Amino acid sequence: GASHPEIEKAQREIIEAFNAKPKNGINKIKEICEQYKISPNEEIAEFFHQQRKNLDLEAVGDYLSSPEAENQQVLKAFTSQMNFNGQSFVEGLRTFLKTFKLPGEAQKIDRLVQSFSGAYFQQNPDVVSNADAAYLLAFQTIMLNTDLHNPSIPEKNKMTVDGLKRNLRGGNNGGDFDAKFLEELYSEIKAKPFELNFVKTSPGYELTSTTLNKDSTFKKLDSFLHSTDVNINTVFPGIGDNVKTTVDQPKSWLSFFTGYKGTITLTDNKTSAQATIQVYTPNIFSKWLFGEQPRVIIQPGQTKESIDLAAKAAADFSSPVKNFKATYDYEVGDLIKAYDNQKKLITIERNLALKA
């Protein structure tokens, strides 16, 4: 319920370091915890709660929703430090979602929802059969919120309480959720929408516009998502010939909620450089919260040379980059310089040496 005395003492230095570069703030907390033998993960989580009014919450949300082991442990502690005892399922989920400047990336949103579902179950074992059941209820409720409150969805076509019960049959660990529980859940979310505050920009390079769908590279990228045995260099000629790829297909609910079409992970088999490419295309449901434009988010991995791989992919589009944002490992200036350098290279390949 409070930060360790040694952390509180250095709160200003930690805050200043974190906002300038999250990694430095996290490292400072870890250094203090090491010196005074303090459990670091719980301390980082407590600091986020304690200093929420002084920290870059977009960065806090990004750290908490990241896939790395440390981050996931901190998120578990962060959510465990919240008190859901006393609240209904919908109210607990509403409180949880309103706590963050929510990431605008599908997998990150998913991890946050999974954290809530696990904590809800831990604190309310009598409601659902298991954590998976809580997760199903959580994402179904999030979809229902859009379904019921998105003006573009005709009243006559919105899900009914009977429809909710029919669709969730067997969703409670093989069994069903109590009918009256679902009727209550439906009414609660219909009567009071969730408060959802998403970040305006995401880490890395984001391409998004009303004409991106006509971009030749975007088209090849979109098709690549459902391709088999195709080298990624057919989409991005710039990259090397030793780049391997894996594609994470989108969960249906994430496609509905955000327009997510999947993430492609590029890995250079020789340099180990890595980069991820997320694709989003708008649909009637996602437009309510994420706009009417397709999006491509490119992020370099932590391994060396990853920045150049990500920059090359971004530079290969004719379409411009709408936003540049620092990642946990790279400052925004480095992303911009790498991208500009790749664009300069392309310019010289097309026009030969600069005239003098």
Coordinates of C-alpha atoms in Angstrom, one line a residue:
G1 CA 0.0 0.0 0.0
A2 CA 3.1 2.2 0.1
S3 CA 6.5 2.4 -1.5
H4 CA 9.6 1.4 0.4
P5 CA 11.2 4.3 2.4
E6 CA 14.3 4.2 0.2
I7 CA 12.2 4.4 -3.0
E8 CA 10.0 7.2 -1.5
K9 CA 13.3 9.1 -0.7
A10 CA 14.4 9.0 -4.3
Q11 CA 11.0 9.4 -5.9
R12 CA 11.9 12.7 -7.7
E13 CA 15.0 11.2 -9.3
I14 CA 13.1 8.1 -10.3
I15 CA 10.2 10.1 -11.8
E16 CA 12.5 12.4 -13.8
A17 CA 14.5 9.4 -15.1
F18 CA 11.4 7.4 -16.0
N19 CA 9.6 10.1 -18.0
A20 CA 12.7 10.9 -20.0
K21 CA 13.5 7.3 -20.7
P22 CA 11.4 4.6 -18.9
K23 CA 14.2 2.1 -19.0
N24 CA 16.4 4.4 -16.9
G25 CA 13.6 4.9 -14.3
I26 CA 13.0 1.2 -14.0
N27 CA 16.7 0.5 -13.7
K28 CA 17.0 3.1 -10.9
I29 CA 14.2 1.4 -9.0
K30 CA 15.9 -2.0 -9.5
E31 CA 19.2 -0.6 -8.3
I32 CA 17.7 0.7 -5.1
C33 CA 15.8 -2.6 -4.5
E34 CA 19.1 -4.5 -4.9
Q35 CA 20.9 -2.3 -2.4
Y36 CA 18.2 -2.6 0.3
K37 CA 17.1 -6.2 -0.5
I38 CA 13.6 -5.3 -1.8
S39 CA 11.5 -7.4 -4.1
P40 CA 11.8 -5.3 -7.3
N41 CA 8.7 -6.3 -9.3
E42 CA 6.2 -5.5 -6.5
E43 CA 8.1 -2.2 -5.9
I44 CA 7.9 -1.2 -9.5
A45 CA 4.2 -1.9 -9.6
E46 CA 3.6 0.0 -6.3
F47 CA 5.5 3.0 -7.7
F48 CA 3.3 3.1 -10.8
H49 CA 0.2 3.2 -8.5
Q50 CA 1.7 5.7 -6.0
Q51 CA 3.1 8.1 -8.6
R52 CA 0.3 7.8 -11.2
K53 CA -0.2 11.6 -11.2
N54 CA 3.5 12.2 -11.9
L55 CA 4.4 9.6 -14.5
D56 CA 4.0 9.3 -18.2
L57 CA 1.1 6.9 -18.1
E58 CA 1.4 5.9 -21.8
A59 CA 4.8 4.6 -20.9
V60 CA 3.5 2.9 -17.7
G61 CA 0.8 1.2 -19.8
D62 CA 3.3 0.2 -22.4
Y63 CA 5.7 -1.3 -19.8
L64 CA 2.9 -3.2 -18.0
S65 CA 1.5 -4.7 -21.2
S66 CA 4.9 -5.8 -22.7
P67 CA 5.7 -9.5 -23.3
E68 CA 9.0 -9.7 -21.4
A69 CA 9.1 -11.9 -18.3
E70 CA 10.0 -9.0 -16.0
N71 CA 7.1 -6.8 -17.3
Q72 CA 4.6 -9.7 -16.9
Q73 CA 5.6 -10.2 -13.3
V74 CA 5.3 -6.5 -12.6
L75 CA 1.8 -6.5 -14.2
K76 CA 0.7 -9.4 -12.1
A77 CA 1.8 -7.4 -9.0
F78 CA 0.2 -4.2 -10.3
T79 CA -3.2 -5.9 -10.8
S80 CA -2.9 -7.8 -7.5
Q81 CA -2.5 -4.5 -5.7
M82 CA -5.9 -3.4 -6.9
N83 CA -9.0 -4.2 -4.8
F84 CA -11.8 -5.8 -6.8
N85 CA -13.5 -7.3 -3.7
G86 CA -17.0 -5.8 -3.4
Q87 CA -17.4 -4.9 -7.1
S88 CA -19.5 -6.7 -9.7
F89 CA -17.7 -8.3 -12.6
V90 CA -18.5 -5.4 -15.0
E91 CA -17.7 -2.7 -12.4
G92 CA -14.4 -4.4 -11.7
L93 CA -13.5 -4.6 -15.4
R94 CA -14.6 -0.9 -15.8
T95 CA -12.3 0.2 -13.0
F96 CA -9.4 -1.8 -14.4
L97 CA -9.7 -0.5 -17.9
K98 CA -10.1 3.1 -16.8
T99 CA -6.8 2.8 -14.8
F100 CA -4.7 2.9 -18.0
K101 CA -3.8 5.0 -20.9
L102 CA -4.5 1.9 -22.9
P103 CA -2.1 0.7 -25.6
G104 CA -3.4 0.9 -29.1
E105 CA -1.9 -2.5 -30.0
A106 CA -3.9 -5.7 -29.9
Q107 CA -1.5 -8.0 -28.1
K108 CA -0.8 -5.5 -25.4
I109 CA -4.5 -4.9 -24.8
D110 CA -4.9 -8.7 -24.7
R111 CA -2.3 -9.1 -22.0
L112 CA -3.9 -6.4 -19.8
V113 CA -7.3 -8.1 -20.1
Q114 CA -5.8 -11.5 -19.2
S115 CA -4.2 -9.9 -16.1
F116 CA -7.6 -8.6 -15.0
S117 CA -9.3 -12.0 -15.6
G118 CA -6.8 -13.8 -13.5
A119 CA -7.0 -11.3 -10.6
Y120 CA -10.8 -11.2 -10.7
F121 CA -10.9 -15.0 -10.4
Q122 CA -8.3 -15.0 -7.6
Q123 CA -10.3 -12.4 -5.7
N124 CA -13.8 -13.9 -6.7
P125 CA -13.5 -17.7 -7.0
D126 CA -17.3 -18.0 -6.5
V127 CA -18.2 -16.3 -9.8
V128 CA -16.5 -18.1 -12.6
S129 CA -15.1 -21.7 -12.9
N130 CA -11.6 -20.6 -13.7
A131 CA -9.4 -17.7 -15.1
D132 CA -10.1 -18.7 -18.7
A133 CA -13.8 -18.3 -18.0
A134 CA -13.2 -14.9 -16.6
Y135 CA -11.1 -14.0 -19.7
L136 CA -13.9 -15.1 -22.0
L137 CA -16.4 -13.0 -20.0
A138 CA -14.0 -10.0 -20.1
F139 CA -13.4 -9.9 -23.8
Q140 CA -17.0 -10.7 -24.6
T141 CA -18.1 -7.8 -22.4
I142 CA -15.5 -5.5 -24.1
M143 CA -17.0 -6.5 -27.5
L144 CA -20.5 -6.1 -26.2
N145 CA -19.7 -2.6 -25.0
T146 CA -18.8 -1.6 -28.6
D147 CA -21.8 -3.5 -30.0
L148 CA -24.3 -1.7 -27.8
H149 CA -22.8 1.8 -27.8
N150 CA -21.4 2.2 -31.3
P151 CA -24.0 4.4 -33.1
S152 CA -23.1 2.8 -36.4
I153 CA -24.6 -0.5 -35.3
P154 CA -28.4 -0.5 -35.9
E155 CA -30.5 -1.1 -32.7
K156 CA -32.3 -4.0 -34.5
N157 CA -28.9 -5.7 -35.1
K158 CA -27.4 -5.4 -31.7
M159 CA -26.9 -8.4 -29.5
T160 CA -29.8 -9.2 -27.2
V161 CA -29.5 -10.8 -23.7
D162 CA -30.8 -14.0 -25.2
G163 CA -28.1 -13.8 -27.9
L164 CA -25.5 -13.3 -25.2
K165 CA -26.6 -16.4 -23.3
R166 CA -26.7 -18.5 -26.5
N167 CA -23.3 -17.5 -27.6
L168 CA -21.6 -18.1 -24.2
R169 CA -23.0 -21.6 -23.8
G170 CA -20.3 -23.9 -22.6
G171 CA -18.0 -21.0 -22.1
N172 CA -17.7 -21.4 -18.3
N173 CA -15.0 -24.1 -18.3
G174 CA -17.2 -26.4 -20.4
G175 CA -20.3 -25.5 -18.6
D176 CA -22.6 -22.5 -18.7
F177 CA -22.6 -19.2 -16.8
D178 CA -25.7 -18.6 -14.6
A179 CA -28.5 -17.1 -16.8
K180 CA -29.2 -14.4 -14.2
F181 CA -25.5 -13.5 -14.0
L182 CA -25.4 -12.9 -17.8
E183 CA -28.7 -11.0 -17.7
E184 CA -27.2 -8.7 -15.1
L185 CA -23.9 -8.4 -16.9
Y186 CA -25.7 -7.4 -20.1
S187 CA -27.8 -4.8 -18.4
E188 CA -24.9 -3.3 -16.5
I189 CA -22.8 -2.7 -19.6
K190 CA -25.8 -1.5 -21.6
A191 CA -26.6 1.0 -18.9
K192 CA -23.1 2.3 -18.3
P193 CA -20.4 2.1 -21.1
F194 CA -16.8 1.5 -20.3
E195 CA -14.5 4.5 -20.0
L196 CA -11.7 3.8 -22.5
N197 CA -8.8 6.1 -22.9
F198 CA -6.3 4.9 -25.5
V199 CA -2.8 6.3 -26.3
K200 CA -2.8 8.5 -29.4
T201 CA 0.4 7.0 -30.7
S202 CA 2.3 3.7 -30.3
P203 CA 6.0 2.8 -30.0
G204 CA 7.9 2.6 -33.3
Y205 CA 6.9 3.7 -36.7
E206 CA 3.2 4.0 -37.6
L207 CA 1.9 4.4 -41.1
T208 CA -1.7 5.3 -41.3
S209 CA -3.7 7.3 -43.8
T210 CA -6.8 7.4 -46.1
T211 CA -4.6 6.3 -49.0
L212 CA -2.4 3.6 -47.4
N213 CA -4.7 0.9 -48.7
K214 CA -3.7 1.8 -52.2
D215 CA 0.0 1.5 -51.4
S216 CA 1.6 -1.3 -53.3
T217 CA 3.8 -2.3 -50.3
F218 CA 0.7 -2.3 -48.0
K219 CA -1.1 -4.6 -50.4
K220 CA 1.8 -7.1 -50.6
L221 CA 2.1 -6.9 -46.8
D222 CA -1.7 -7.5 -46.3
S223 CA -1.6 -10.6 -48.6
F224 CA 1.6 -11.9 -46.9
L225 CA -0.4 -12.4 -43.7
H226 CA -2.2 -15.4 -45.2
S227 CA 0.7 -16.6 -47.4
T228 CA 2.8 -19.8 -47.2
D229 CA 6.4 -20.3 -48.1
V230 CA 6.9 -16.7 -49.3
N231 CA 10.1 -14.7 -48.6
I232 CA 9.4 -11.4 -46.9
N233 CA 11.9 -9.7 -49.2
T234 CA 9.1 -9.9 -51.9
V235 CA 7.3 -7.4 -49.8
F236 CA 10.4 -5.4 -48.7
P237 CA 13.1 -5.6 -51.3
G238 CA 15.3 -3.5 -49.1
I239 CA 15.9 -6.1 -46.4
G240 CA 18.4 -8.9 -46.7
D241 CA 18.0 -12.4 -48.2
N242 CA 18.5 -14.0 -44.8
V243 CA 15.3 -12.7 -43.1
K244 CA 12.9 -15.3 -41.8
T245 CA 9.3 -14.7 -40.7
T246 CA 6.6 -16.0 -38.5
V247 CA 3.0 -14.7 -38.5
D248 CA 0.8 -14.4 -35.4
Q249 CA -2.8 -14.8 -36.6
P250 CA -5.3 -12.4 -34.9
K251 CA -7.7 -13.7 -32.3
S252 CA -11.2 -13.0 -33.6
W253 CA -12.2 -10.8 -30.8
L254 CA -9.1 -8.6 -31.3
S255 CA -10.0 -8.3 -35.0
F256 CA -13.5 -7.2 -34.0
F257 CA -12.3 -4.8 -31.3
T258 CA -9.3 -3.2 -33.1
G259 CA -9.2 -4.3 -36.7
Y260 CA -6.1 -6.3 -36.0
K261 CA -5.0 -8.6 -38.8
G262 CA -1.9 -10.0 -37.2
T263 CA 1.8 -9.4 -36.4
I264 CA 4.7 -10.5 -38.6
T265 CA 8.0 -11.1 -36.9
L266 CA 11.1 -10.6 -39.0
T267 CA 14.4 -12.2 -37.9
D268 CA 17.7 -12.0 -39.7
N269 CA 19.3 -15.5 -39.4
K270 CA 22.8 -14.0 -39.6
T271 CA 22.7 -10.8 -37.5
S272 CA 19.8 -11.8 -35.2
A273 CA 18.2 -8.4 -35.9
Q274 CA 14.5 -8.4 -35.3
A275 CA 11.4 -6.3 -36.1
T276 CA 7.7 -6.8 -35.7
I277 CA 5.0 -5.5 -38.1
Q278 CA 1.4 -5.2 -37.0
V279 CA -1.4 -4.7 -39.5
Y280 CA -4.8 -3.2 -38.7
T281 CA -7.7 -2.6 -41.2
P282 CA -10.9 -0.8 -40.1
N283 CA -14.3 -2.5 -39.7
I284 CA -17.6 -1.2 -38.4
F285 CA -16.8 -2.2 -34.8
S286 CA -13.2 -1.0 -34.6
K287 CA -13.8 2.4 -36.2
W288 CA -15.7 3.5 -33.1
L289 CA -12.5 3.5 -31.1
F290 CA -9.6 3.3 -33.6
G291 CA -10.8 5.4 -36.5
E292 CA -11.4 4.7 -40.2
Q293 CA -7.9 4.2 -41.4
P294 CA -5.7 1.1 -41.8
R295 CA -2.5 1.1 -39.7
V296 CA 0.9 -0.5 -39.9
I297 CA 3.1 -0.4 -36.8
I298 CA 6.7 -1.4 -37.2
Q299 CA 8.9 -1.9 -34.1
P300 CA 12.6 -2.8 -33.8
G301 CA 13.6 -5.6 -31.4
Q302 CA 16.2 -5.2 -28.6
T303 CA 18.9 -7.0 -30.5
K304 CA 21.6 -5.1 -32.4
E305 CA 20.9 -3.9 -35.9
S306 CA 17.1 -4.3 -35.2
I307 CA 16.7 -0.5 -35.7
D308 CA 18.1 -0.7 -39.3
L309 CA 15.8 -3.7 -40.1
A310 CA 12.7 -1.9 -38.9
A311 CA 13.8 1.4 -40.6
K312 CA 14.2 -0.4 -43.9
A313 CA 10.8 -2.0 -43.7
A314 CA 9.2 1.4 -42.9
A315 CA 11.2 3.2 -45.6
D316 CA 10.1 0.7 -48.3
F317 CA 6.6 2.1 -48.2
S318 CA 5.8 4.9 -50.7
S319 CA 3.5 6.1 -48.0
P320 CA 5.0 8.4 -45.3
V321 CA 5.3 7.5 -41.6
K322 CA 2.6 9.4 -39.7
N323 CA 4.2 9.0 -36.2
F324 CA 7.6 8.2 -34.8
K325 CA 7.7 7.2 -31.1
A326 CA 10.5 5.8 -28.9
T327 CA 10.5 2.2 -27.9
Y328 CA 11.7 0.9 -24.5
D329 CA 15.1 0.4 -26.0
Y330 CA 15.5 3.1 -28.6
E331 CA 15.1 6.9 -28.4
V332 CA 12.8 8.5 -31.0
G333 CA 15.8 10.4 -32.5
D334 CA 17.5 7.1 -33.3
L335 CA 14.4 5.8 -35.1
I336 CA 14.0 9.0 -37.1
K337 CA 17.7 9.1 -38.1
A338 CA 17.7 5.4 -39.1
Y339 CA 14.5 5.9 -41.2
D340 CA 15.8 9.1 -42.8
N341 CA 19.1 7.4 -43.7
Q342 CA 17.2 4.6 -45.4
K343 CA 15.1 7.1 -47.3
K344 CA 18.3 8.8 -48.4
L345 CA 19.8 5.5 -49.6
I346 CA 16.7 4.9 -51.7
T347 CA 17.0 8.4 -53.1
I348 CA 20.6 7.8 -54.2
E349 CA 19.7 4.4 -55.7
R350 CA 17.0 6.1 -57.8
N351 CA 18.9 9.3 -58.7
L352 CA 22.6 8.3 -58.4
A353 CA 25.1 10.5 -56.6
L354 CA 23.9 13.9 -55.4
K355 CA 24.7 16.7 -57.9
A356 CA 27.5 19.1 -57.0

